[model samples]
Target: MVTPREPKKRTTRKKKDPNAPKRALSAYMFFANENRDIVRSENPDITFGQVGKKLGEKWKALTPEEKQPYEAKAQADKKRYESEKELYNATLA
Candidate 1:
């Protein structure tokens, strides 16, 4: 779960990386989708909206620095979801 907590100041210089493309969906939305897919595979009774709420709650708890990696994490989750769709489905059964 990602949250919106304040980040601590780092003593060391931070490394800068090239900016990545912006996602079509907000971080909150992306994480919600990821969470929903994982949960639904285990329990089909879960609702999509519930997943969104979960994502929002989770995102609110993350620090600013932590949120920086959300884009990469969400992208990875999407790829994993696609590649392991069958596995996820099987898990539910």
Candidate 2:
């Protein structure tokens, strides 16, 4: 097993870009955001984070016909994110 969390230099990934526009959520992500309450209604038996199993399964059960609107939301948001990133880049330049 690895050592305890005392050594601070281990975080070499250094991920988030400072001042960058956040990335767009995927089509499934957009669907989950809208349908979580519906999932809770089916399994009021749900809890946060653990809800992933039930929610993901439900999305997998969706027809492409039903999944249309969610992809639309993600498409719009993805377009929005691209423009925002370009604007930020131009401003920084």
Candidate 3:
């Protein structure tokens, strides 16, 4: 009797170039970076992973007004990235 054969796997990932522009951070990431240290300091007994959880919790607990500053910063960062990306692409061309 003939045995069934599995199909070959496909690899679609492109090799990463060291010169590629760094990816932009999201609003949530901005929040995390700003607050991670503060949360860690307050909960000295907690593990590093738990500090992340606390930061996430604090972000969720914030009101829209409280979150506005972080969101605004993220927007500014995104604009800067777009401008720089255009300049970098022009250099390639």
Candidate 4:
């Protein structure tokens, strides 16, 4: 009988910028702003703090597997924004 080999796990590592903004304003601010608009539409009087707290709570409640999807989406969006900004700047020069 032949022993089966186990598949190697894939690693996806992104380079971290030490000087990136603390609030992640450039990377994720656009998505948050859009989400905030959706929240406000359901509750016209919603405060910014309340919206933030709600998101924080939801994040805290997710399992590791459930959180992976959000992480992947954020990573994809970050790459998209970074690439787009670079192309735009090159055009300006």
Candidate 5:
């Protein structure tokens, strides 16, 4: 009698290309970059993980007007990334 064997599972992770352009940062990430130091200084006793949670809370509390600058920066960064990606892809062709 022939025995059945289990099929191998495929890996979900993709290999990263060294030549690939870096991903653009989101508005919240830009905000985090700008304010992380200030938050750390304000709460020296807080753990690193708690600092992230606090920053998330602060981001959520911001008004649209307060977030506008970060959003604009992210938009500009995305545009730059797209242009670079196009050039990089062309080199691969």
Candidate 6:
């Protein structure tokens, strides 16, 4: 079959600034980074989606003391990444 008009045109999305400011992982995510492997190792048959479900259950049960380690990085990291963001914005301006 022959195609009709080759193409009209599409609106282009502006490119993402490989800008440093991005949604880095949360405290829970930090916990997941280290702990996901542990859960996966426990049951090799666990599907990717179910792993998160199980992880959430464990995360909810954590003591504040245990969660605080990853929590600290989330707070401390803010002062770090913001500095790069404004510099990136200024470059665009």
TM-score of each: 0.34, 0.69, 0.69, 0.40, 0.73, 0.64
lDDT, candidate 2, 1-93, per-residue tens: 586767667533455664577767688878997778777766776686657786787787888777888988888889889887887687766
| Positional deviation of residue 55's Cα in model 2 after best superposition, in angstroms | 1.1
Point out where model 3 deviates above 4 Å.
Answer: 1-19
Please give the ranking of all candidate structures by lDDT, highest first, separated by commas.
5, 2, 3, 6, 1, 4
TM-score of 1: 0.34
lDDT of 4 by residue, 42-90 (tens): 7777787777777556554665465556555666666766765665556
Give the per-residue lDDT digits (tens) of candidate 3, residues 1-93. Answer: 275586566454455543455556677877777787777778888997888876777797997677788888788788877776776676655
- The residue ranges of model 1 lying beyond 4 angstroms of the native Cα positions read 1-24, 39-43, 71-93
Q: What would you estimate as the lDDT of candidate 3?
A: 0.73
Instruction: Write down the lDDT of every candidate, Cα atoms only.
Output: 0.57, 0.76, 0.73, 0.55, 0.78, 0.73
Runs of candidate 6 exceeding 4 Å displacement: 1-20
- The per-prediction CA RMSD against the true structure, in angstroms, equals 16.0, 7.1, 9.5, 12.4, 9.8, 11.1
As for model 2, its CA RMSD to the true structure in angstroms is: 7.1
Worst 10 residues of 3 by lDDT: 10-19
Q: After superposition, how far is residue 17 of candidate 6 from its true place, in Å?
A: 6.5
Candidate 2 TM-score to native: 0.69
Report the number of clashing residue pairs per model: 10, 0, 0, 0, 0, 0
Report lDDT (Cα) of residue 50, candidate 3: 89
Model 6: lDDT equals 0.73
Candidate 1, 1-93: lDDT as tens digits = 386577767454454423322224455556555656765676677576765565567666666665667666666656665545554455534
Quick one: best lDDT, which candidate?
A: 5
